[PDB]
Amino acid sequence: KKERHCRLTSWIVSQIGPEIEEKIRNSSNEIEQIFLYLLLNDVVRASKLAIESKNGHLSVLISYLGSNDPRIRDLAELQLQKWSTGGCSIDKNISKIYKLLSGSPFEGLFSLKELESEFSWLCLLNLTLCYGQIDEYSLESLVQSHLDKFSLPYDDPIGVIFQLYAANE
Amino acid sequence: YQTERFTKFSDTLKEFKIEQDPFNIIREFRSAAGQLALDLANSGDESNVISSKDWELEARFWHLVELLLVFRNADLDLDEMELHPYNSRGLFEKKLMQDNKQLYQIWIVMVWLKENTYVMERPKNVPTSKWLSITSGGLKSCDLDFPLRENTNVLDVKDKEEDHIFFKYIYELILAGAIDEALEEAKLSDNISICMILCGIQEYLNPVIDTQIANEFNTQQGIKKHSLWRRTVYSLSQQAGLDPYERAIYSYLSGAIPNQEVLQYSDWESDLHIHLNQILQTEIENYLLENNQVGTDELILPLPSHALTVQEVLNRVASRHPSESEHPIRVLMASVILDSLPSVIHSSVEMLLDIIDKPYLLRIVTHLAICLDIINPGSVEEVDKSKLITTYISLLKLQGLYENIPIYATFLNESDCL
Amino acid sequence: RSKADVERYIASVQGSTPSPRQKSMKGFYFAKLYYEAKEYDLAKKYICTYINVQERDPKAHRFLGLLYELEENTDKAVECYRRSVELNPTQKDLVLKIAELLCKNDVTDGRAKYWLERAAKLFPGSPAIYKLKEQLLDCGGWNKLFDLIQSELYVRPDDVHVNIRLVEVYRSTKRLKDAVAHCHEAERNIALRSSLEWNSCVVQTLKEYLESLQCLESDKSDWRATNTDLLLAYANLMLLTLSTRDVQESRELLQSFDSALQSVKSLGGNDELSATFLEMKGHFYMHAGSLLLKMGQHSSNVQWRALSELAALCYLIAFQVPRPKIKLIKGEAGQNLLEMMACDRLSQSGHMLLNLSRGKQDFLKEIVETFANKSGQSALYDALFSSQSPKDTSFLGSDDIGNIDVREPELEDLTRYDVGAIRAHNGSLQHLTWLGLQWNSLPALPGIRKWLKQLFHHLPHETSRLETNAPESICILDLEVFLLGVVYTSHLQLKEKCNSHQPLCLPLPVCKQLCTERQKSWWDAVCTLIHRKAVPGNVAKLRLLVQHEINTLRAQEKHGLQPALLVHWAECLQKTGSGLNSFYDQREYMGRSVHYWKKVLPLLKIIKKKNSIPEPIDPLFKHFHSVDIQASEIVEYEEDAHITFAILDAVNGNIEDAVTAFESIKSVVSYWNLALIFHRKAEDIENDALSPEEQEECKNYLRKTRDYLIKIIDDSDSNLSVVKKLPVPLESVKEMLNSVMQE
After folding, report:
1. A vs C: CB pairs below 8 A
2. DSSP-derived 3-state class of residue B221
3. DSSP C139
4. Residues 6+ apart with CB under 8 A from B61
5. How many Å apart are CA B107 and CA B276, to the nearest integer?
6. How far is it, in rounded angstroms, from Cα B281 to Cα B110?
């Protein structure tokens, strides 16, 4: 399961690669770049840029992405509720990153679903597959979880294959 | 009454020679000294606070002795661990600590060091929530890294003052081994992100893959890209505009040596602890590199690769704390740590031929020598036992406790002459 | 960014993906940055091209609709929202928007009506829904609008905005008598009385009627009646303005209040108006004192002490004012209201008087001896108002400050003031969390269980169906357990705040939210649910919102409870229950206490060996290392818990094991339990005809009772710390002993 997961996610990163690299080319904000590096499933360069842009704590936090530590998951979500109940202002991309640490980035109450309009469906699916709750789910039911949140274009065949894969039963 | 003391120690020896395992002797010696440490400490002349600390020290010595000799001597050799390359770093760390006794000893010693570390009382009136700067307006982001992204002028003074209280408390807890309490404090004091940082301490294990620990664990845990984590933390530790205790924490976690502002207040024990931690960290990461269980991507930054020897750490920490270093039971502490112990026995023996000036010493060395030859027959030279007991006995006489001299006699035919 | 940053990125992805389809699929992400660079004729064409290839994306379609909204092209913007809505039905907010825009542009078509119906069922009775209902009607007509409001008020009588509109419609037809009439009948509504904007409307519509030609012509009999409501409105409006509004606005409201008081005192008499003036007079000073303390908080230390000195006098004046003559009012509703406010005055001013007097020794005496002088009256008018205003018609300057009691309040009186004033501010968790904190510094504890009984009547102490967390099984225990955490949490949060920078000294209006919005949302939900003022549509949502937290109040799966808070719950319920008289209540509170204990001890054992507790995920009650349990206190809790176990064993019938446990620990509390249970075994068997040998054994128990009560009093009189450990009052222990020995 781990092997298969790693190959799938390396491949998705192969596909979304240029899209995101373009987006990083045009960003004017460092924390957003850090997020985009997480979009390429590159935890280390996110951590590094964080470090460099003087965002050190975040940097540490980032290092958890891809270990599925449920403690960190519920803590990140907690921080998010506390902000989303008062929290006079939190940077738009730090909240996104915390939402990634929450393990349920659309499935949620600070939801990245609106990124539906800014990214390839495959890009977001990468987010579910990499963070998302890897251990608790089978590859199939995980992918299915994601698909349940987003309609794919009828005509797109790589979409179709994911649907047939997730459809299992 | 307190001029009972010798009885207690003598008493323990009685019980041992009479139920005809010897590690209990020392355990009792420890408790005995500790009990006495309490007596002189409670209500006392301020001439007693000194000899009270010399008893607490006494006690710690017996403890250290127990721990190390138990591990070294109760060594009955178990089964070797057979890893594969597919195995997690967690297992390799474990293997390292199993196979390398020299290094596990360092662990034992650090454990002892932590055991005896002071921690402040839990801060009272802690606030409802973090950086509550928010109220002044001006936190555009509520994340720890915001005032790092742009001038620290963002954070209110009182907030910094509280962050100071927190990070200092967490630091003391970390040096004491209280990692669970540190995580509890982080959680409960609305420092979730710092908590999360403290979670990176564990190497990765997966009970499913790393079969040989499918007992201790039911769920994967720990973090796979640890060499990264470690550079990430260390770099964070070097970034200024953080509270000195926070930086201190990250230093300790990265296997590094905390900043001057914090380190200046560390004593022999604290400092020694810091540097053994460094030895240890470095040695593990090297063990992992020699087995290709580190991935090149993670070598973000240079950390030092050359581990000190316990010998050298001791020498340096010594020269950094000469007064403390030279204290006669702490010399024994080091002597035990390096195993050069009969070495020092025979030594302080020849110092009877400014050891007579301090009272605990002549006693301690004698009872230690006794314990040693009990646990390891042959340990201390026959002569040295003779000389030591001879002199201590003559003090049992000077104290007028002839009553309990036969017990000490049970180690020579020289006893004939009493 | 600039124009160059975004138009240079054109060549960035143009050189990475040059085919027309991928060039157009980047249009949305091209348009993403032109919306940020203030380019709307350009951003429009970028998104519109991505829509040419990705015609089924609800996000892109909405984004163009939101962009056509900035362009104010209603026909185009609406259509865009429609496409995003028909693609994805979960976009509720867009169904409102469509309905919102259709009614604003043109109502002639029924399509605007249809979309409004859907918007209503997606947001049951939201504030915007009525707004749209009025907009649609807008397109001589006066009667038509009135019927809408009335039909709307039938099912939504607690809506602030709608009731306001009714007064405005009355005022538009210049039938002000009806405006005040409804205004008066509505001042009985407990919700509206708490609405800042409503009370503001109440103040105006009344004044307008006083000056109105209709007020004089009609009669001078009911003139007094309406005049009373103005003062009441002023009091409520003052309470609210002080909390939300800024320093300037609050002070300004005081002048209108003082003008009204001066204009009213001249009439006097012995009727509702006179009684109202009495109670409102007290409120004035109390709020004025609260107002004073607000200014000083921000100000320097010298002004603080002088202002707090001044405020202390104000609160004192208020507290002194006697309980208003309740019998003297026409109706049951009116008189109960007036008394409710009286309790509120004494309670709020009371705690303030104390918290200010705890600063120094008999600090209160000095305040009166120095500022009770008429010189203080001018120093009060000075600090509060600008001296330019005429000091003759200002009530503050003309009041006869005679014989200030200068007697600190008694706790027992304070408790009954609080309990009677729980319904003062509609039981807002703000109100209770404040009181709970004010009692956090006192040696006597508040009757929380009595507060909740005053709020949710006939809500069982413990629900039979404890197995599930369905919120039909909510119990006064759950609430009692809840408020305890809310206050235990609140105190720690404020403690942390001031540490970075007294917390007790803040008055109720001045301080901000003391609980987390999560906690407040729960209390407001369970309150609306219980009192039956929920919404058929929102019933299921409210119900689930409550359900979410139940499992934590009962320490079930994934409870966000720090061990210290659980222990606090356990002991706080034991001692709460151990002092109760009835068995039903004793059993329940002791049961829950044992329950929470049984959940902590596993944690304490791990903590006993200096390990780490697994920290929570988004806990309901914030964790704190300030109160993290230490090994120094573990053995005590294990002991204190074992008592709680024994107590429940005794109440259930396992006397043998209870005594065996009680006797094991020589604690003052174990005596009162040992004594109380030895006395019962004696009293029942003491006088019936029965074996003489048994009678001697029966007397023997009564002899043990006497001894244990004497051990309590002997150890009690000697040491004060033991007096506080008594599970019941000392005088109660002595009371039993008198009867025990006369037996």
Report:
1. 74
2. strand
3. -
4. B33, B329, B332, B333, B336, B364
5. 8
6. 12
Contact criterion met (CB < 8 Å) for B126 and C495: yes
Interacting residues of C175 by C-beta distance below 8 A, sequence separation 6+: none
B128·C492 Cβ contact <8 A? yes
What letter does residue B223 receive in the DSSP assignment?
Answer: B
Structural Rg of chain C based on CA atoms: 33
Option in A18, A71, A117 nearest C60 (CB): A117
What radius of gyration, in Å, describes the C-alpha atoms of chain A? Answer: 16
| Sign of the torsion angle spanned by Cα atoms B123, B126, B129, B135 | negative
Contact assessment for residue C124 and residue C96, using Cβ atoms and an 8 Å cutoff: no
Going by C-beta distance under 8 Å and a sequence separation of 6 or more, which residues neighbour residue C253?
A: C234, C237, C238, C241
- Number of helical H runs and strand E runs in chain A: 9, 0
Q: How is residue A103 written in tokens?
A: 């393990």
Cβ contacts of C492 on chain B, cutoff 8 Å = 125-128
Give resolution, Å, one decimal: 37.0
Name which of B122, B321, B147 is nearest B239 in CA terms: B147
Q: Which subunits have 3 or more CB–CB pairs within 8 Å of chain C?
A: A, B
Measured in Å, how far apart are chain B's first and last C-alpha atoms?
28
Please name the residue of chain A whose CA is at the shortest distance from the CA of residue B136. A88
* C-beta separation of C15 from C32 below 8 A: no
The structure's method of determination equals cryo-EM
Return the closest-CA partner of residue C230 out of C219, C238, C220, C242: C238
**Through-space distance between the first and last CA atoms of chain A, rounded to whole angstroms:** 18
Rounded to the nearest angstrom, the minimum Cα separation between C591 and chain B is: 27
Cα(C598)–Cα(C595) distance, integer angstroms: 5
The one-character DSSP state at B301 is S
Q: Say how far apart CA C98 and CA A24 lie, in whole Å.
A: 36
Structure tokens at B302: 């240079």
Rounded Cα distance between C454 and C527, Å, is 13
Question: Cβ(C426)–Cβ(C191) under 8 Å?
Answer: yes
The chains found to touch A (3+ Cβ pairs under 8 angstroms) are B, C
C711, amino acid identity: K
Contact C117/C129 with Cβ under 8 angstroms? no
A59 contacts on B by Cβ (under 8 Å): 145, 232, 235-236
How far apart are the C-alpha atoms of B303 and B275, rounded to whole Å? 15
Is residue C494 within 8 A of residue B127, CB to CB? The reply is: yes
Q: Given an 8 Å threshold on Cβ–Cβ distance, is C499 in contact with B179?
A: no
State the residue for tokens 């705040």: C497
Chain A residues closer than 8 Å to B228 by CB? 43-44, 47, 63
**CA A1 vs CA A8, A135, B215, C391, C648: distances in Å:** 11, 9, 22, 85, 52
CA dihedral C46, C51, C54, C59 (to 10 degrees): 90
Q: Write down the residue that tokens 């002048």 correspond to.
A: C255
CB interface of C with B, residues 598-627, below 8 Å: 606-607, 610-616, 619, 622-627
Within B200-303, residue ranges assigned H as helices are 226-238, 244-253, 260-263, 268-290
Compute CA B64 distance to the chain's CA centroid, rounded to the nearest angstrom: 9
Measured between CB atoms, which of B145, B195, B220 is closest to A75?
B195
Contacts of B187 in chain C (CB under 8 A): 562, 613, 615-616, 619, 623
Q: Which residue of C has its CA nearest to B126?
A: C496
Most B CBs within 10 A among C297, C441, C496, C515, hence the mutation to make, goes to C496
Structure tokens at C536: 């058929």
CB contact under 8 A, A28 and C618: no
CA distance C149 to C166: 7
- CA C441, C444, C445, C451 torsion: positive or negative? negative
